[PDB]
Structure formats: structure tokens, C-alpha cells
Design a protein around this ligand. Sequence first.
Ligand code: HEM
Ligand code: HEM
Lengths: 458, 458
Amino acid sequence: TIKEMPQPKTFGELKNLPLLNTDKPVQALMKIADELGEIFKFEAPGRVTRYLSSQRLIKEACDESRFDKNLSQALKFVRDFAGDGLFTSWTHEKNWKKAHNILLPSFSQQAMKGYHAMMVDIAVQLVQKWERLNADEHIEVPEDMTRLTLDTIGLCGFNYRFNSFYRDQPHPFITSMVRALDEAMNKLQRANPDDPAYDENKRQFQEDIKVMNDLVDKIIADRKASGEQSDDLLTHMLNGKDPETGEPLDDENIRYQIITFLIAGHETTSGLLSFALYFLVKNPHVLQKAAEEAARVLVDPVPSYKQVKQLKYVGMVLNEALRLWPTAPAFSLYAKEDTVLGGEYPLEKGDELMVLIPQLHRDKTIWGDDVEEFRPERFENPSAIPQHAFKPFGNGQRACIGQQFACHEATLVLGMMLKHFDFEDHTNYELDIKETLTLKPEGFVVKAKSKKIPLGGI
Amino acid sequence: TIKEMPQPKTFGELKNLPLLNTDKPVQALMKIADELGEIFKFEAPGRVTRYLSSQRLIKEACDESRFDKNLSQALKFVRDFAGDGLFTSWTHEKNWKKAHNILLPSFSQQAMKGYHAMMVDIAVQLVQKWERLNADEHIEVPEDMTRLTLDTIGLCGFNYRFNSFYRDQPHPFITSMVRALDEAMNKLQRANPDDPAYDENKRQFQEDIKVMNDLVDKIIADRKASGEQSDDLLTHMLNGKDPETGEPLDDENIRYQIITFLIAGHETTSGLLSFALYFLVKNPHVLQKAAEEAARVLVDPVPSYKQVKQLKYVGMVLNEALRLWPTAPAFSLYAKEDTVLGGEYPLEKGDELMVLIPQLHRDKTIWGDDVEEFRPERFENPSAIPQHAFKPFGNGQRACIGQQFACHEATLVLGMMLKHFDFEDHTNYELDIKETLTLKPEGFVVKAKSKKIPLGGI
Ligand code: HEM
Ligand code: HEM
């Protein structure tokens, strides 16, 4: 029977909008979901969305016959620099299906065999950095993880070295990307967007868009001008034809794809690695199990592709980190036609839903009462997990195209870290989660004592 | 560096085979392992296996990239009546993966909420039996535990009442199941099984298979006709679809699954309860601690699901019984590819291993020197145990699908026993372990004096 959904506290004519005027909006929404349950309405001037937290409702939301990907206000703002790349395109735009069909084979599990050597190149740089620290020094974890994941997508994707391990201050492209992302996210919480105060932000936004476009357009133009057949994502985009339309991507869409991949590789996989290491140092029996596996499996001076596929327990660790802190924590959907959600909530065509992934992943009816505990063993027998219960990579045809890339990279790197070092939570670090496009453990530091195991050449 | 492995005494061209021509083969193999150490070769005419006893080697055997489940000769003979049910199927058989995907969510810890009431039905029957004994009487422990466990899987699994507490002699189906298993196990010694001497054995075997098939097929046929929904394992099997293939199980395979569950829920699961109660009566301070927990937690006339989940020390007692006398004490593996075990023992593709679980569980490098002592406190934090050190339910994707079911049932029943009765080892019983498919403390008897605490309705 039909039910009225709950709604969090309001602010007069601003409705719920000021609830997002916080540097930690997803975390605020999680606390609201804890108070209100599996569904709540969230209203702002001119817009309504419904936040879903239960597997029961989210499984219905994931029915692609009833619901399609929506661009949230955040993604609409990100679209000012990521364009109609795969992440910020509507499913019905021609460039979505074109790019999807062209790029899917380049992101497959099979494709990882070809990226593996370049992934190892950057992972060796990380391990060497940490081998070279002095006794009294420590590691800035999200910082080094971001250096690694950005450089890996730059190299594997476009044969471009950001050389982030040679820098304190980020590459200029990244300065502009990060500042562009910050502006996109800050705009969400402004009650008066056109206020004269925000004039200067808008000028900086246009300058950062120009830095990004200029470097990426030059990368593309340089590759076209050289003729080089590097066999990377850029080569595949320049030469590939969509089997369905027979058309290639144009150079402007290629730029948007490249921007999109650099955003992804800076923002998400780095957070996964950071959270994984956080949980490992907070759960030393789990760390022991992962380290024992790394030692047993990674028998050669550098890891092979086959060896990375052998690291089951490291995979379980990564999935359990994705469970607790999925680093792209929300995705949006719209109702394709009028429909009733969960037998109880009537929706009209066009109505928006938000899937709160960290809450889905804390659904006690699925996972049990111990949802805050870090237990990789939850994933030991993967078929035990119900359908649509675990969605850190989104849903259906609009799921993360980078999933195999992220998993392979993270498994490789975490395996190598655990083979080469013991870790100490020397500050007894208190988890503090910063929110940008994604989630990361801000200020997370550790000490790493080398096991003094030689590392092979690249 | 490459070692030759030890081998127990041989009998000319019969090799090691006569060592298993004994009433207690697992216990013989344990003694061989004490003599020979972590690995030994066992040869019979036409075959070889290697028995493993250390965590150091078993952790490698449990690497699913390197080794998969093998059907031992015993499981090949059980397959004559358990078919391609989950326990007697190869991982590469379509019906293994289909049934695995369909059934696993119905055996989860969360699924136990739905079975709990039916489990209580049978547990109340056990408690009422014991409340109704006269002062001069005693309890035949494995016999009553088997009545409980069989009836619980019958009721929870397919809404069938064996009514074992209304009988002295087994239900006709069970007579046939036990005699089929006996025949399967006896066939392990027979040199020329096509000898006319065994014609009656073959006739009896076919008759026993017919008894089991007729009942189970009728159960299935009766349910399909009615359209009755019971939320039980049969309902799930009739309606469920494998997410991967999109196919349901066929009726023949469902029958094999039901036969398989009945085998499992008989003495394999009742052995846990029997050994647990044995160890409790032999360790009165442990019994007292467990009884104190039961009294503190089980404050209502019948136990709730949540209350059973609070019986931590009862669960520790059960784990410690599984440590010493795991009731499915060995499992078989085969090498997927050529590989070296432990840096020392080269194996070829197809080579077989046997994991001797009771010996694994006595590895002093893992458990310390006191491995024969019954100390439930070893399990205060099960996360402290290394990977592949405590394996009473097997390994990985071929682990026991019934683990949560068995543990929940055993915790519930043992908690109620400890709430309702004091126990006396009135005969000072000498442990005598009978071997079939499983292990049982044969002849174990106790007296139970009622605490005279009322029991609720079902
Ligand atoms: C742990 C790491 C990652 C996580 C958790 C993650 C998560 C997600 C999620 C949840 C979506 C769906 C978004 C929505 O529905 O609005 C998505 C889409 C996407 N991700 Fe990722 N991602 C990760 C890594 C990557 C990487 C490494 C790349 C590329 C190199 C990438 C590229 C994309 C793209 C292109 C899409 C859009 C796909 C489409 O709609 O066609 N991601 N990701
Ligand atoms: C204390 C009780 C039990 C113990 C110690 C036990 C132990 C085991 C072990 C060691 C295996 C792996 C066998 C191998 O690798 O060859 C296994 C498999 C299995 N067990 Fe159990 N079990 C118990 C209770 C149950 C119950 C109650 C059920 C069902 C009602 C069940 C159903 C199964 C099934 C279907 C498999 C095959 C799983 C697969 O390969 O997909 N077991 N059990």
C-alpha cells in the first residue's frame, strides 16, 4: 500500500538545500539515512530527489527497463569540462553509445594483460620512493596513492608521464583539474549562484578549462602528427570505429574522454588504495593474511599478470574497502515512465533517485548486524552476495568502464606494498574523510619498514 | 630444494592399500601423519595421493588458482545416489555452478532467520524428550543428536517430518541412505567388484537408491502440483533461477540436492553436537562457563534468532569441538597445472592431494603446544587464526554450503540443553570414535537432570 516518504529538516524557502552546505555532504546524507531509513525525499528550490539506501529498493532502481542514468546537478557542473565523455553523457546521446562501443574492448579483463607492464612501471616508482625514505620519515598515503593512480592512467592510457613522483606540487594540468572539480562541487551549495562575490571563481573556472583543453588537445594533435602506433587508449580512440554507426570519435569527444579518464584515475582508485591501507593498519590480523598471501604469491622480482590474478585475499580486502567506503559514493537515476517503487512509492516519468552506495553497503538485512566491521571474508565465496547488494562500480550499461583497470591496478600495487614493507599506524590516525568528487582519508599517514626484498627492473 | 616424500609401510604389490582395511581409517592416517610429518605419499594399485597435515602446505593446497576439488573414490561411489548434487559434482559441471549460485543466498547467515522457527520446533522436541525421562534413565547422545539434526534438515529443507523422536528404528529412507553409504564405503576395499559374490550387494544398493529416489521425487512432484510456498529450500529450488545462465535446476538435480542435504544433516552435523557435549562433560569448568552464558542470554521461554547470535561462548565450544574432531575430516584436491608444493615437492597436472583436517588442527606451529586440550578460549577472536589453519568446512568456492545452518542449529540446541539440564558423565565414558562417512563418539551416554525451567510453545 502507498506510503508518504520521510524528509529531513527544512530551512524555510530553501527547503533541504542547506543540508548540503557542508564540506562532507555524502557523510551528512548517510546520517540522515540512518535516521530516516531506506528512502527519503530531498527538496531544493526547483528540484526534488529521492535518496535510496536499501537493497530492496535499490534492486528495483537498477532495473534498466524502468530507470536510466541521470546527471545530478554535480555531474551537470562537471560536464562543463568533461563534456559528453562517457561519465557525463546521457545514455540517449549518440556519443555515449559510440564511445562505449569503441572503448569497451580496451577496458576488458583481456586488455589488462597489455596494460600490466606500464602499471608495474609506476608501482616500482612507488615502492622505490618508500624504500628510499629515512628512518624518521613517514608516508602521506592519499598523496602517494594519487601520484600512483594518476601516473598510471596517464602512461597506460596516453603514453604521457605526469612524473608525479618527481614533484611536490602537482602537474599544472592537475592543478587546474582539481580546482575545476572544486568549483563544480562548491556550486552545489550556493543559495545565490549569480551573487557578484562569485565573479572571480567564474573567471578562474574558465582559465582552468582552458589549461585542460590546451594540454589534452596538444596530446591528441601531437599523436596525430607523429603517426606513432603506441597501442594505448589514445591510439584506439584515433583509429577505432564504432561497429554500430561505423563512425569514429571526433577529436573534441576524444579530449573529453581523456579528461574523464584523468579525473577517474586521480579521484577514485587512489581513494580505494588509501582506504584499503587504512583498514589494513587498523586490523592487523587482516594485514597479516594479506601480507602472507603477497609473500606466497609474488615470488618473482616483479609481479606478472598471472600472479596478480592469484591474489584472492588482496581482492577480498579491496572489495571490503569498497563496501565500507565506495569512493564514488552516489549515482543518480530517473524514471523512464510512471512507475511504483517497492509497491509503496509512486513515481512520475522523469522523477530522480539517488543511490547512496555506502548505505546500501550497510544494509543489515543483507550483510548482518556487524556492518561497520572490516571483514574481507565476506567475499570469500562471492556467489553468496545477493544480486544488486554490492554496487561500488554503479549499474548496468552505465557501470564503471574502468572497473577491471582499477581492480587490476589496486591489486598489483597493494600486493607489492604488502610484499615489500611492514606498516605502522604511528599516529593512531583518526579517520577523517574529505569529499571532492570522491572520498579519501585526509591526513592518513603511516611508517613503512622495508622487508629488504630486492625489486626487479621494469 | 626438491625432497622425496615419506611413505608408510607397504604390502608388496598392494602398496599402502591394506592400511585402510580397518574400522578406523582416518584415525590410522592421523597416526601415520604423527610418525611421518606434514606430507606423505599413499599408493594403491593404480593410484597415488599425498596426505597433507601442516598449515604451511595446506595454505598452498587451498589456492584455488592451483588446485580444485577432487572427487575421491569414496565420493565417486556416493555419486551413484547423490548424483550431480553440490557435494559430488566437479566444479566444471554446469549443474555445480548453477546449483551453487541458486542455493548460496538461501544458506546465508541471514537466511537462518527464516529457518529459526522450524529449528526451534525440533529443538523443543529434543528438550521435551529429556524432560520426560525417568530418574533411572540415561541419554544415548549421538542417537538423539541425529534425531535432531536429520529432522531439522527435513523440516527446514522441504517441510518433511521424519518424526525421528517418535521412532526407535530409522525412517525407511534413512535405513536405505545409511546402507547405501555403507555399501559406498565398503566398495573401497573390493579387489574385483564384478565378482558374483557381490551380486546381492548390487541388488541391495539398487533397492536402496530406489527407496531414496521414490520418496524425494514424490516430495518434489507433490510440491509442484500444489503451488504451495513454504520459503523452504525446496521452494527456492523450484522457483530460483541461476543469475549466470538464467536457468533453473531441473527436477532430477533438485532430488540430488535434497538427498545430499539429508546425508549432510544426518551424522555429519550430529557429530558436532555429540563431540561438543563429550568435551563439555569431560571439562566441567568449560561446561559451567557455557551454562552460565546460556542462562544469562536465553531469558525467554524459547530462544530468538538474536539470542542465539549472542551465544558467543557456546559458538567457541562448537569451534573447539570442530578443531579436535572435525566430522568431515578429509577432502581431496587435484593440481590444475604442474606446480611445486612448498618449494620441495613437484606435482604434475592432475596429481591428487588429501587434506587431513584433524592433523591440520593439531599443527603446533599454529595452535601452540597444548593442541590436545579442549580450550574454547582459542576462539575468542576467530580473526586471529591464520588463513587455511581452521578448515572444518572445507575451502573456498567448494566450502560447505551448510556451515551457517549447522552452526546456527548446533548453537541453538546446545544453548537450550545447557539452559535446561545439568549433565553427568555417569559411566566415565571412554571415547571410541566410529568411522563411516563421518566421525561419531560411539556409545556416548550421559544423564541429564532437569533444572525444571519452563519451556515455551513452538
Ligand atoms: C575504485 C575505482 C573506481 C570506482 C569506485 C569507480 C566508480 C564508478 C561509478 C560508481 C560509476 C557510475 C557513475 C554513475 O552512474 O553516475 C563509474 C563510471 C565510470 N567510471 Fe569509474 N570508478 C573507478 C575507477 C575508474 C577508472 C580507473 C576509470 C578510467 C580509467 C573510470 C572511468 C569511468 C567512466 C568512463 C565511467 C562512465 C561509464 C559510462 O557511463 O559509460 N573509473 N565509475
Ligand atoms: C558440522 C557439520 C558439517 C561439516 C563439518 C561439514 C563439512 C563439509 C566439508 C568439509 C565440505 C567440503 C567437502 C569437500 O571438499 O569434498 C562440505 C561440503 C558441503 N556441505 Fe557440509 N558440513 C556440515 C554440514 C552440512 C549441512 C548441514 C549441509 C546441508 C544441509 C551441508 C551441505 C554441504 C554441501 C552441499 C557441500 C558441497 C558444497 C559445494 O561443493 O558446493 N553440510 N561440508
